[PDB]
Design a protein around this nucleic acid. Structure first.
Ligand SMILES: [Br-]
Ligand SMILES: [Cl-]
Ligand SMILES: [Cl-]
Ligand SMILES: [Cl-]
Ligand SMILES: [Cl-]
Ligand SMILES: [Cl-]
Ligand SMILES: [Mg+2]
Ligand SMILES: [Mg+2]
Ligand SMILES: [Mg+2]
Length: 736
RNA sequence: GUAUGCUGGAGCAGCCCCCGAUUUGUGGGGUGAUUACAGC
């Protein structure tokens, strides 16, 4: 259980993880800070306060030195325990505690209730098993950390606790596909589109399978932006960065940083079109984006982009003649413009009615959904109620502090917070008191829904229109608003549809299907069609509309994938064989009985195994020597990668048991001012021939680093030396 | 394609509802604003 209890061969699971951390720190020395900041690039809200961010920026050498120390400690029989001590002082400990409390908050606030406690990373000034798992997570792919946590967790008795604890501890891991030698990003986009399309649409997964992976995210926009930029040099989409409780989202059109994220806000992007006399910039929604993709795929991209470019000219012409212009042109103009010219004004009475109906509706739905809502949703509602009853509104610090109480199921500390607001005369005794009779987030949430609905279902008074936001003093000149509007134009919904398919009776989905059937690809989605329709419910009920739209956008993504593959160098486009339901690629090695690997649609998440071609070649050659031609991924995993992993555990356990026997038999000691005995210095004191010591070191190094850089004869010699020193294992290697 | 505080503008965009509909509609109505916005 404690980290001290892992001695000799029991260290093996840590040996494998930490050697991979060093394997990966040799590919990229920046991984500690990269991993700590990965999520915070996507957050307006600071993951870290200012001094924590400062510590993180300085920490690479410290963290890289600790990574090497622990790898040394876990890769030796006996190493000084000093490396397992982090003082309260320690930069790395502060960083780790902040990153971990942030990951726990991120897990808890997406749950509907707080069920479990999380393990401590430290006990006194000593790292725990959970602390060691957390430290290594920063350097390794998800699959390495899952393998470590699976070996060392005491929590697997409770599946829910095991997986939530794992979620927190693995928050900062690398994606399984993090490292590649591929230089053509069209190769990686091809794989990413295929992986996403092979994930089952969430709603269909829950119906057919609810208790391939589940699709969790819609990546249509991301893919569409990469495809439109690759096809149309005139077009460039806004990239996001955050300038540093809250940072500033800045949108720019700099391409220089390949991996920089596109700006996507509520299914809107910013497009810059460089035609004629200079660039023009628009906001474009999903609706216009998906029609632009459809038009681009059919060869009308240049024409569509010309019509978007000219859009601003039409708006500027209409703006001078709003009173007299055709009512059909009112669609391009925001409310404030039409209302300034006496078009579609509403009586304050009507504005009150619509506003109060809406806010009433919002709170009746919250009241009905309390048990299904997330802790973050419930906490935000409770905080809105307290904030709207405060003499002076929460500052960011006050808000954050109370949010942390509510998300953490700390109802005592939340109620101590209300007491402090009461003693400060910020809220009156009634507001403090309505919470006195509650002990749970759900109870508090119901009380708040009831207080708000009581306020909203009063016979309309002056206090009510202020409460629902109709009381604000607008002091901005119409002419300032018009000027702002002209530098921030958004494309009217249905614009491209009306320009190209005016008299079409075919919806978006049928237009996509007609292009797929007649366009010349003869491809369709590889997922079973039942994943895009529930036959048992009506055409328009529940998820069926959303799944039907998903079939059309997946078909767009397949055609984008077709464009990317078709665009890559013929050397690479001609080796691969892509069917509706499979990808076949050649495996290196196995000369005489040459080989290919066949990924089914359910395996497209694993196409990253192609990034280490030498390892896949040796896995097939050494674990599957008799197989020739086409091999299923499933077979490569079960007979190859799983077989390798089983052997690797036995060789690492063997090597550590060897060190223990040879250090204690030959009664060995460390140098004065050294932490462990070099494995060289241990072999130097063996009864082995040179050829035996060479092979032992090479086979050891291979299993420590997860590769196959040795020959079958050299494993023979390793196996001989283990047998000669008492440590046998059922190697099951070499293979029949 | 997470509204973690407050002020003010913006709902052409995004999203929702009603109506229509082998489905995502330049039909109708909303959206106490999500922000290529300006401030505390
Ligand atoms: Br290899
Ligand atoms: Cl990553
Ligand atoms: Cl490449
Ligand atoms: Cl009121
Ligand atoms: Cl098999
Ligand atoms: Cl070799
Ligand atoms: Mg405001
Ligand atoms: Mg609107
Ligand atoms: Mg605002």
């Amino acid at each position: 259980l404690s980290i001290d209890e892992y001695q000799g061969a029991r260290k093996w699971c840590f040996t494998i993880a930490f050697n991979k951390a060093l394997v990966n720190r040799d590919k990229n020395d920046g991984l500690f800070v990269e991993s700590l900041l990965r999520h915070e690039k996507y957050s307006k809200h600071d993951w870290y306060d200012e001094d924590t961010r400062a510590l993180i920026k300085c920490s690479t050498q410290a963290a890289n030195a600790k990574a090497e120390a622990l790898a040394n400690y876990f890769s030796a029989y006996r190493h000084s325990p000093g490396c397992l001590t982090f003082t309260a002082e320690d930069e790395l400990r502060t960083i780790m505690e902040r990153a971990y409390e942030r990951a726990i908050f991120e897990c808890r606030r997406r749950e509907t209730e707080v069920i479990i406690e999380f393990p401590s990373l430290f006990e006194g000034d000593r790292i725990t098993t959970a602390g060691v798992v957390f430290f290594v997570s920063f350097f390794v792919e998800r699959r390495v950390l899952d393998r470590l946590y699976g070996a060392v967790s005491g929590l697997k008795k409770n599946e829910g606790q095991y997986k939530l604890t794992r979620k927190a501890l693995s928050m900062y891991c690398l994606k399984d596909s993090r490292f590649t030698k591929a230089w053509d990003k069209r190769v990686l986009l091809f794989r990413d589109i295929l992986a996403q399309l092979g994930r089952i649409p969430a709603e269909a997964y829950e119906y057919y399978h609810g208790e391939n992976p589940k699709r969790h995210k819609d990546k249509f926009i991301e893919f569409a932006l990469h495809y439109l930029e690759a096809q149309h040099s005139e077009i460039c989409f806004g990239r996001r960065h955050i300038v540093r409780t809250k940072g500033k989202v800045v949108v720019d059109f700099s391409k220089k940083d390949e991996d920089q994220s596109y700006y996507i806000s509520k299914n809107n992007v910013i497009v810059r079109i460089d035609k004629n006399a200079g660039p023009r910039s628009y906001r474009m929604g999903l609706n216009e984006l998906k029609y632009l993709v459809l038009l681009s795929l059919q060869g009308k991209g240049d024409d569509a982009i010309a019509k978007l470019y000219r859009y601003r000219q039409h708006v500027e012409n209409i703006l001078d003649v709003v009173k007299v212009t055709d009512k059909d042109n009112h669609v391009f103009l925001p409310r404030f413009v039409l209302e300034q010219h006496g078009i579609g004004r509403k009586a304050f009475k009507q504005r009150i009615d619509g506003r109060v109906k809406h806010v009433r509706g919002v709170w009746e739905k919250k009241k009905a959904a309390t048990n299904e809502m997330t802790l973050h949703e419930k906490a935000r509602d409770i905080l809105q109620y307290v904030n709207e009853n405060c003499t002076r509104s929460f500052n960011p610090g006050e808000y954050n502090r109370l949010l942390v109480c509510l998300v953490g199921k700390d109802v005592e500390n939340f109620q101590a917070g209300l007491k402090r607001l009461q003693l400060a005369e910020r809220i009156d005794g009634r507001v403090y008191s309505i919470f006195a009779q509650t002990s749970t987030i759900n109870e508090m949430h119901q009380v708040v829904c009831d207080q708000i609905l009581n306020r909203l279902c009063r016979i309309g008074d002056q206090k009510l229109y202020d409460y629902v936001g109709l009381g604000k003093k607008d002091e901005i000149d119409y002419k300032q608003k018009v000027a702002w509007f002209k530098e921030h134009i958004s494309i009217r919904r249905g614009f491209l549809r009306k320009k190209f398919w005016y008299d079409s009776k075919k919806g978006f989905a049928k237009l996509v299907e007609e292009h797929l059937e007649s366009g010349g690809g003869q491809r369709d989605v590889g997922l079973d069609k039942k994943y895009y329709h529930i036959d048992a419910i009506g055409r328009f009920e529940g998820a069926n509309p959303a799944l039907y739209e998903t079939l059309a956008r997946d078909r767009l993504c397949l055609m984008m994938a077709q464009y990317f593959l078709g665009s890559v160098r013929k050397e690479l486009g001609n080796k691969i064989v892509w069917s509706n339901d499979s990808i076949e690629l050649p495996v290196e090695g196995s000369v005489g009985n040459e080989k290919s690997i066949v990924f089914s649609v359910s395996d497209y998440g694993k196409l990253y195994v192609l990034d280490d071609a030498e390892f896949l070649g040796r896995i097939c050659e050494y674990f599957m020597p008799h197989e020739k031609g086409k091999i299923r991924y499933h077979t490569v995993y079960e007979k190859g990668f799983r077989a390798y992993n089983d052997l690797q555990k036995k060789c690492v356990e063997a090597v550590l048991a060897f060190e223990e026997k040879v250090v204690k038999a030959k009664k060995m000691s460390e140098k004065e001012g050294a932490h462990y005995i070099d494995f060289r210095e241990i072999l130097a004191q063996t009864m082995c021939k040179e050829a035996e010591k060479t092979a032992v070191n090479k086979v050891a190094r291979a299993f420590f680093a997860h590769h196959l850089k040795f020959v079958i004869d050299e494993f023979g010699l390793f196996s001989d030396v283990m047998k000669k020193y008492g440590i046998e294992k059922e190697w099951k290697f070499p293979v029949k």
